[PDB]
Tab-separated table of C-alpha atoms and ligand atoms in Angstrom:
chain	number	residue	atom	x	y	z
A	16	UNK	CA	-58.315	25.658	10.266
A	17	UNK	CA	-57.320	25.983	6.799
A	18	UNK	CA	-59.564	24.099	4.495
A	19	UNK	CA	-59.240	23.053	0.493
A	20	UNK	CA	-62.975	24.965	-0.233
A	21	UNK	CA	-66.691	25.737	1.272
A	22	UNK	CA	-69.852	26.426	-0.285
A	23	UNK	CA	-72.058	29.956	-0.885
A	24	UNK	CA	-75.582	30.245	-2.035
A	25	UNK	CA	-76.777	27.627	0.344
A	26	UNK	CA	-74.233	24.946	-1.267
A	27	UNK	CA	-75.295	25.825	-5.235
A	28	UNK	CA	-71.596	27.801	-5.174
A	29	UNK	CA	-68.378	26.112	-4.717
A	30	UNK	CA	-65.710	28.725	-2.993
A	31	UNK	CA	-62.025	27.073	-3.585
A	32	UNK	CA	-59.705	29.000	-0.569
A	33	UNK	CA	-55.920	28.358	-1.889
A	34	UNK	CA	-55.444	29.596	-5.704
A	35	UNK	CA	-52.321	27.973	-6.310
A	36	UNK	CA	-53.446	24.494	-5.129
A	37	UNK	CA	-52.532	21.893	-7.775
A	38	UNK	CA	-55.619	19.640	-6.806
A	39	UNK	CA	-58.291	22.291	-7.340
A	40	UNK	CA	-59.347	20.938	-10.948
A	41	UNK	CA	-60.566	17.642	-9.019
A	42	UNK	CA	-63.555	19.891	-7.579
A	43	UNK	CA	-63.699	22.431	-10.047
A	44	UNK	CA	-64.372	20.331	-12.733
A	45	UNK	CA	-67.643	18.274	-11.311
A	46	UNK	CA	-69.124	22.044	-10.701
A	47	UNK	CA	-68.048	23.398	-14.175
A	48	UNK	CA	-69.276	20.526	-16.317
A	49	UNK	CA	-73.124	20.986	-14.489
A	50	UNK	CA	-72.652	24.893	-15.881
A	51	UNK	CA	-72.193	26.495	-12.404
A	52	UNK	CA	-70.108	29.465	-11.910
A	53	UNK	CA	-67.080	28.978	-9.348
A	54	UNK	CA	-65.454	31.575	-6.600
A	55	UNK	CA	-61.915	31.237	-5.659
A	56	UNK	CA	-60.702	33.342	-2.774
A	57	UNK	CA	-57.009	34.639	-1.740
A	58	UNK	CA	-55.772	35.495	-5.320
A	59	UNK	CA	-55.048	39.269	-4.292
A	60	UNK	CA	-52.289	37.715	-1.457
A	61	UNK	CA	-50.279	36.253	-4.886
A	62	UNK	CA	-50.078	39.838	-6.736
A	63	UNK	CA	-47.865	42.667	-6.739
A	64	UNK	CA	-50.264	44.983	-4.579
A	65	UNK	CA	-48.408	48.436	-5.630
A	66	UNK	CA	-49.129	47.408	-9.253
A	67	UNK	CA	-53.110	47.618	-8.909
A	68	UNK	CA	-53.401	51.031	-7.060
A	69	UNK	CA	-55.587	53.986	-8.566
A	70	UNK	CA	-52.825	56.567	-7.844
A	71	UNK	CA	-50.114	54.262	-10.039
A	72	UNK	CA	-52.598	54.279	-13.333
A	73	UNK	CA	-53.040	58.133	-13.088
A	74	UNK	CA	-49.406	58.670	-12.519
A	75	UNK	CA	-48.082	56.361	-15.446
A	76	UNK	CA	-50.978	56.760	-17.753
A	77	UNK	CA	-53.047	60.017	-16.868
A	78	UNK	CA	-52.557	61.890	-20.247
A	79	UNK	CA	-54.451	59.534	-22.599
A	80	UNK	CA	-57.650	60.356	-23.882
A	81	UNK	CA	-60.955	58.062	-23.332
A	82	UNK	CA	-64.577	58.483	-22.630
A	83	UNK	CA	-66.573	57.543	-19.599
A	84	UNK	CA	-70.289	56.068	-19.048
A	85	UNK	CA	-72.655	58.200	-16.287
A	86	UNK	CA	-73.942	54.657	-15.070
A	87	UNK	CA	-76.813	56.590	-13.352
A	88	UNK	CA	-78.472	57.377	-16.981
A	89	UNK	CA	-75.850	56.025	-19.618
A	90	UNK	CA	-74.786	59.041	-21.179
A	91	UNK	CA	-71.441	59.292	-22.590
A	92	UNK	CA	-68.484	61.610	-21.469
A	93	UNK	CA	-66.194	61.944	-24.408
A	94	UNK	CA	-62.669	62.429	-25.290
A	95	UNK	CA	-61.669	63.496	-21.550
A	96	UNK	CA	-58.431	62.377	-19.814
A	97	UNK	CA	-57.777	59.283	-17.838
A	98	UNK	CA	-56.424	61.173	-14.883
A	99	UNK	CA	-59.930	62.922	-14.680
A	100	UNK	CA	-61.287	59.276	-13.840
A	101	UNK	CA	-58.674	57.730	-11.667
A	102	UNK	CA	-58.449	60.693	-9.436
A	103	UNK	CA	-61.994	60.842	-8.402
A	104	UNK	CA	-61.686	57.014	-7.740
A	105	UNK	CA	-61.793	57.223	-3.799
A	106	UNK	CA	-61.839	61.214	-3.131
A	107	UNK	CA	-65.299	61.957	-3.839
A	108	UNK	CA	-64.773	65.956	-4.082
A	109	UNK	CA	-62.692	65.407	-7.226
A	110	UNK	CA	-65.406	63.740	-9.490
A	111	UNK	CA	-66.847	65.270	-12.580
A	112	UNK	CA	-70.360	66.408	-11.464
A	113	UNK	CA	-73.492	66.350	-13.618
A	114	UNK	CA	-75.530	69.514	-14.075
A	115	UNK	CA	-77.417	68.782	-10.849
A	116	UNK	CA	-74.149	69.359	-8.982
A	117	UNK	CA	-73.981	65.769	-7.765
A	118	UNK	CA	-70.609	63.739	-7.961
A	119	UNK	CA	-71.184	61.304	-10.851
A	120	UNK	CA	-70.848	57.527	-10.695
A	121	UNK	CA	-68.229	56.839	-13.506
A	122	UNK	CA	-67.229	53.644	-15.886
A	123	UNK	CA	-64.023	54.193	-17.775
A	124	UNK	CA	-65.040	52.828	-21.250
A	125	UNK	CA	-62.625	50.062	-22.858
A	126	UNK	CA	-59.390	50.904	-21.348
A	127	UNK	CA	-56.560	49.789	-22.015
A	128	UNK	CA	-58.374	49.732	-25.450
A	129	UNK	CA	-59.017	46.488	-27.267
A	130	UNK	CA	-56.204	44.199	-27.034
A	131	UNK	CA	-53.199	46.522	-25.726
A	132	UNK	CA	-53.286	45.375	-22.254
A	133	UNK	CA	-49.866	43.705	-22.485
A	134	UNK	CA	-48.166	46.207	-24.803
A	135	UNK	CA	-49.353	49.147	-22.325
A	136	UNK	CA	-49.118	47.420	-19.143
A	137	UNK	CA	-46.482	44.043	-19.645
A	138	UNK	CA	-45.521	43.979	-15.847
A	139	UNK	CA	-49.327	43.972	-14.824
A	140	UNK	CA	-49.936	41.234	-17.651
A	141	UNK	CA	-46.512	39.356	-16.053
A	142	UNK	CA	-48.457	39.472	-12.473
A	143	UNK	CA	-51.727	38.653	-13.445
A	144	UNK	CA	-51.021	35.543	-15.986
A	145	UNK	CA	-48.584	33.963	-13.516
A	146	UNK	CA	-51.031	33.948	-10.768
A	147	UNK	CA	-54.460	32.934	-12.392
A	148	UNK	CA	-56.481	29.944	-10.426
A	149	UNK	CA	-57.008	26.944	-12.570
A	150	UNK	CA	-53.966	27.617	-15.035
A	151	UNK	CA	-55.078	24.310	-17.281
A	152	UNK	CA	-58.276	26.156	-17.939
A	153	UNK	CA	-57.123	30.041	-17.854
A	154	UNK	CA	-53.388	30.211	-19.155
A	155	UNK	CA	-53.429	30.983	-22.946
A	156	UNK	CA	-51.575	28.040	-23.565
A	157	UNK	CA	-53.066	25.700	-20.528
A	158	UNK	CA	-53.633	21.909	-21.465
A	159	UNK	CA	-57.655	22.428	-21.382
A	160	UNK	CA	-57.832	26.062	-23.039
A	161	UNK	CA	-58.879	25.271	-26.500
A	162	UNK	CA	-58.711	28.977	-27.430
A	163	UNK	CA	-55.655	28.698	-29.998
A	164	UNK	CA	-56.638	25.127	-31.032
A	165	UNK	CA	-60.111	25.945	-32.812
A	166	UNK	CA	-61.047	26.392	-36.679
A	167	UNK	CA	-63.171	29.349	-37.892
A	168	UNK	CA	-66.225	27.317	-37.409
A	169	UNK	CA	-65.710	28.548	-33.424
A	170	UNK	CA	-65.948	32.325	-32.184
A	171	UNK	CA	-62.226	33.054	-30.793
A	172	UNK	CA	-61.987	35.438	-27.664
A	173	UNK	CA	-59.894	38.321	-28.401
A	174	UNK	CA	-56.675	38.367	-26.595
A	175	UNK	CA	-57.256	39.852	-23.189
A	176	UNK	CA	-57.248	40.449	-20.340
A	177	UNK	CA	-59.686	43.342	-20.083
A	178	UNK	CA	-60.029	45.578	-17.271
A	179	UNK	CA	-63.056	46.788	-15.761
A	180	UNK	CA	-62.768	50.100	-13.827
A	181	UNK	CA	-65.737	51.797	-12.175
A	182	UNK	CA	-67.068	53.892	-9.038
A	183	UNK	CA	-69.234	52.325	-6.500
A	184	UNK	CA	-73.116	52.994	-6.764
A	185	UNK	CA	-74.174	54.962	-3.565
A	186	UNK	CA	-77.470	55.978	-2.846
A	187	UNK	CA	-81.115	53.963	-2.697
A	188	UNK	CA	-82.145	54.940	-6.104
A	189	UNK	CA	-78.656	53.552	-7.347
A	190	UNK	CA	-80.060	50.167	-6.039
A	191	UNK	CA	-82.097	49.655	-8.812
A	192	UNK	CA	-78.990	50.501	-11.606
A	193	UNK	CA	-76.381	48.316	-12.844
A	194	UNK	CA	-72.529	48.941	-13.200
A	195	UNK	CA	-72.533	46.573	-16.283
A	196	UNK	CA	-76.119	45.399	-17.408
A	197	UNK	CA	-77.280	41.820	-17.986
A	198	UNK	CA	-75.283	40.289	-21.081
A	199	UNK	CA	-73.717	36.813	-22.125
A	200	UNK	CA	-70.386	35.861	-23.439
A	201	UNK	CA	-69.732	33.199	-26.004
A	202	UNK	CA	-66.347	32.280	-24.409
A	203	UNK	CA	-65.895	31.189	-20.719
A	204	UNK	CA	-64.169	34.108	-18.326
A	205	UNK	CA	-62.279	34.446	-14.774
A	206	UNK	CA	-62.644	38.208	-13.432
A	207	UNK	CA	-60.161	38.806	-10.746
A	208	UNK	CA	-60.951	41.869	-8.256
A	209	UNK	CA	-57.467	43.172	-7.789
A	210	UNK	CA	-58.570	46.488	-5.622
A	211	UNK	CA	-61.496	47.850	-3.943
A	212	UNK	CA	-61.557	51.557	-2.824
A	213	UNK	CA	-63.570	52.740	0.179
A	214	UNK	CA	-64.094	56.418	-0.409
A	215	UNK	CA	-63.794	59.625	1.810
A	216	UNK	CA	-65.934	62.834	1.951
A	217	UNK	CA	-69.121	60.890	1.801
A	218	UNK	CA	-67.085	58.157	3.856
A	219	UNK	CA	-70.153	56.836	6.083
A	220	UNK	CA	-71.902	54.775	3.597
A	221	UNK	CA	-71.644	51.388	5.066
A	222	UNK	CA	-75.170	50.788	5.934
A	223	UNK	CA	-76.851	51.113	2.282
A	224	UNK	CA	-73.925	48.371	1.251
A	225	UNK	CA	-75.536	46.174	3.839
A	226	UNK	CA	-79.320	46.876	2.664
A	227	UNK	CA	-78.066	46.544	-1.326
A	228	UNK	CA	-76.544	42.895	-0.274
A	229	UNK	CA	-79.548	41.700	1.742
A	230	UNK	CA	-82.103	43.044	-0.924
A	231	UNK	CA	-79.680	41.401	-3.616
A	232	UNK	CA	-80.592	37.976	-2.175
A	233	UNK	CA	-77.027	37.382	-1.048
A	234	UNK	CA	-76.476	33.999	1.467
A	235	UNK	CA	-76.076	33.951	4.990
A	236	UNK	CA	-72.180	32.200	4.670
A	237	UNK	CA	-71.725	35.597	2.416
A	238	UNK	CA	-72.836	37.951	5.147
A	239	UNK	CA	-70.486	36.411	7.993
A	240	UNK	CA	-67.389	37.282	5.536
A	241	UNK	CA	-68.105	41.099	6.277
A	242	UNK	CA	-69.119	40.978	9.735
A	243	UNK	CA	-66.551	38.441	11.286
A	244	UNK	CA	-63.282	38.774	8.826
A	245	UNK	CA	-63.530	42.458	7.888
A	246	UNK	CA	-63.059	41.672	4.118
A	247	UNK	CA	-63.625	44.387	1.549
A	248	UNK	CA	-66.744	43.979	-0.600
A	249	UNK	CA	-66.168	45.231	-4.360
A	250	UNK	CA	-69.172	44.367	-6.300
A	251	UNK	CA	-72.856	42.198	-6.362
A	252	UNK	CA	-73.231	39.781	-9.175
A	253	UNK	CA	-76.253	38.046	-10.404
A	254	UNK	CA	-75.605	34.912	-12.830
A	255	UNK	CA	-78.053	32.818	-14.441
A	256	UNK	CA	-77.355	29.319	-16.174
A	257	UNK	CA	-76.605	29.266	-19.993
A	258	UNK	CA	-79.910	27.206	-20.247
A	259	UNK	CA	-82.293	29.849	-18.495
A	260	UNK	CA	-81.271	32.385	-21.281
A	261	UNK	CA	-84.291	32.061	-23.463
A	262	UNK	CA	-86.766	31.926	-20.425
A	263	UNK	CA	-85.071	35.513	-19.551
A	264	UNK	CA	-85.492	37.045	-23.050
A	265	UNK	CA	-89.434	36.067	-22.534
A	266	UNK	CA	-89.892	37.954	-19.295
A	267	UNK	CA	-87.799	41.193	-20.828
A	268	UNK	CA	-90.063	41.116	-23.979
A	269	UNK	CA	-93.062	41.003	-21.739
A	270	UNK	CA	-91.817	43.790	-19.491
A	271	UNK	CA	-90.835	45.917	-22.508
A	272	UNK	CA	-94.256	46.017	-23.975
A	273	UNK	CA	-95.774	46.740	-20.783
A	274	UNK	CA	-93.291	49.419	-20.319
A	275	UNK	CA	-94.718	50.430	-24.282
A	276	UNK	CA	-91.244	49.773	-25.819
A	277	UNK	CA	-91.909	48.780	-29.627
A	278	UNK	CA	-89.734	45.761	-30.519
A	279	UNK	CA	-90.085	42.554	-32.982
A	280	UNK	CA	-90.950	39.340	-31.355
A	281	UNK	CA	-87.575	38.005	-32.453
A	282	UNK	CA	-85.313	40.902	-30.901
A	283	UNK	CA	-82.833	40.059	-28.315
A	284	UNK	CA	-83.062	41.978	-25.123
A	285	UNK	CA	-79.938	39.988	-23.284
A	286	UNK	CA	-77.851	40.985	-26.419
A	287	UNK	CA	-78.898	44.779	-26.394
A	288	UNK	CA	-77.275	44.962	-22.929
A	289	UNK	CA	-79.937	47.584	-21.785
A	290	UNK	CA	-81.022	45.733	-18.681
A	291	UNK	CA	-80.410	45.462	-15.058
A	292	UNK	CA	-82.814	42.901	-13.038
A	293	UNK	CA	-83.618	44.770	-9.980
A	294	UNK	CA	-85.148	42.779	-6.759
A	295	UNK	CA	-88.742	43.358	-8.464
A	296	UNK	CA	-87.553	41.643	-11.948
A	297	UNK	CA	-85.615	39.232	-10.026
A	298	UNK	CA	-88.789	38.038	-7.931
A	299	UNK	CA	-90.698	37.758	-10.979
A	300	UNK	CA	-88.093	35.756	-12.905
A	301	UNK	CA	-88.039	33.118	-10.284
A	302	UNK	CA	-92.141	33.301	-9.582
A	303	UNK	CA	-93.517	33.602	-13.578
A	304	UNK	CA	-90.560	31.761	-15.239
A	305	UNK	CA	-89.220	29.236	-12.710
A	306	UNK	CA	-85.762	30.715	-12.971
A	307	UNK	CA	-83.332	30.886	-10.078
A	308	UNK	CA	-79.825	32.969	-10.244
A	309	UNK	CA	-76.776	32.817	-8.096
A	310	UNK	CA	-76.283	36.505	-6.137
A	311	UNK	CA	-72.525	36.388	-5.601
A	312	UNK	CA	-70.422	39.231	-3.429
A	313	UNK	CA	-66.922	39.285	-5.108
A	314	UNK	CA	-64.491	40.799	-2.003
A	315	UNK	CA	-61.054	41.821	-3.063
A	316	UNK	CA	-58.872	39.117	-4.296
A	317	UNK	CA	-61.923	36.950	-5.231
A	318	UNK	CA	-61.861	35.434	-8.868
A	319	UNK	CA	-65.352	34.851	-10.208
A	320	UNK	CA	-65.437	31.990	-13.131
A	321	UNK	CA	-68.479	32.732	-15.691
A	322	UNK	CA	-69.530	29.796	-17.619
A	323	UNK	CA	-69.992	30.587	-21.546
A	324	UNK	CA	-73.254	31.870	-22.631
A	325	UNK	CA	-74.488	32.619	-18.698
A	326	UNK	CA	-76.387	35.618	-18.330
A	327	UNK	CA	-74.450	37.950	-15.914
A	328	UNK	CA	-74.894	41.647	-14.315
A	329	UNK	CA	-72.444	43.299	-11.892
A	330	UNK	CA	-73.391	46.412	-9.247
A	331	UNK	CA	-70.181	47.725	-7.775
A	332	UNK	CA	-70.913	48.507	-4.173
A	333	UNK	CA	-67.955	50.410	-3.740
A	334	UNK	CA	-65.277	51.902	-6.444
A	335	UNK	CA	-63.461	48.472	-8.008
A	336	UNK	CA	-60.424	47.625	-10.335
A	337	UNK	CA	-61.092	44.083	-11.805
A	338	UNK	CA	-59.247	42.205	-14.635
A	339	UNK	CA	-60.654	39.249	-16.627
A	340	UNK	CA	-59.259	36.573	-19.273
A	341	UNK	CA	-61.255	34.832	-21.733
A	342	UNK	CA	-60.764	30.749	-22.303
A	343	UNK	CA	-62.577	28.343	-23.905
A	344	UNK	CA	-63.202	25.179	-22.029
A	345	UNK	CA	-64.068	21.568	-23.315
A	346	UNK	CA	-67.039	21.714	-20.896
A	347	UNK	CA	-68.495	24.964	-22.691
A	348	UNK	CA	-67.195	24.825	-26.267
A	349	UNK	CA	-70.782	24.605	-27.928
A	350	UNK	CA	-71.238	27.835	-27.024
A	351	UNK	CA	-68.767	29.523	-29.539
A	352	UNK	CA	-69.893	27.069	-32.359
A	353	UNK	CA	-71.014	28.861	-35.665
A	354	UNK	CA	-73.659	26.034	-36.732
A	355	UNK	CA	-76.633	23.873	-35.996
B	21	LIG	O1	-68.244	45.349	-15.389
B	21	LIG	C1	-67.891	44.337	-14.724
B	21	LIG	O2	-67.550	43.874	-13.673
B	21	LIG	C2	-68.033	43.336	-16.024
B	21	LIG	C3	-68.199	43.494	-17.301
B	21	LIG	C4	-68.500	42.737	-18.275
B	21	LIG	N1	-68.743	41.061	-17.994
B	21	LIG	C5	-68.672	40.670	-16.762
B	21	LIG	C6	-68.273	41.906	-15.722
B	22	LIG	CL1	-47.289	47.452	-16.310
B	23	LIG	CL1	-55.686	23.512	-13.729
B	24	LIG	CL1	-74.154	47.776	-19.975
B	25	LIG	CL1	-73.458	25.015	-20.998
B	26	LIG	MN1	-69.357	39.795	-19.152
């Protein structure tokens, strides 16, 4: 039967089932006030699916100049055409290659650039903004979005949305690597998976995806979404409570020292955005510091709600297109205040 919601992460994570249910807020707000992330499924079914394909982005915008990042080693690939990224999104043998002759796992950096998303893509913008879940929190003018309502004593988010476009990580070695390293944001965000590209060429990569999710510490209810409903999984997230950030900094300072980094006792390994917590570091965080995370698999059409100040990392399993809107909820407004 259709239900309003379910739980993932053994009851620690709310999953809302209907993105346009006008009563979602009553369930949402109790979980959110406690600083938990929230998942809303089914957003893809509300969108104009033809607007969110990699072929359309290449055809319409292929001639713009951009930089990419090699996810395996962090190297910048400078001043290439945005078609060089998109045409290899799903066809492996079209990807830029590294010195070793392997097809590279790439991230498109800052595209569309800064705040130009609405000017460059006004139909996409309309399609996203009209279908975001919890609209009183997430729309630019929502009754519970304080973004446009706060003085300069608060850090206000840039006008979005932001696009996050990147290939999936492939091999056993890539299991220890991030699409996006551990970092925190001073605003709230809703991040929506609008497209998951399962490749072809080396299209027999189904089994390393299960070992990544398994070793990623994903729950049994989450593994059932693959094997029973055949939903497409895009990315593996780890998110931590805002209250645990300083314990995460102490660990990463200790591990820096152990690896002979030379860093002042004050420097911020979260703000550096230089760490991905692999199974070894996540186990050590739990055991030595008492800190437990939420391991979240974002499928096509899942919306991930990210509490302000909450450290998070993402590991794309397959090539992903996602779009995120920043907002400022009353529940978390402390995290963007500039005093005390
Ligand atoms: O690459 C992502 O998916 C991402 C980047 C930054 N914050 C959240 C998610
Ligand atoms: Cl558009
Ligand atoms: Cl709402
Ligand atoms: Cl990063
Ligand atoms: Cl908080
Ligand atoms: Mn982020």
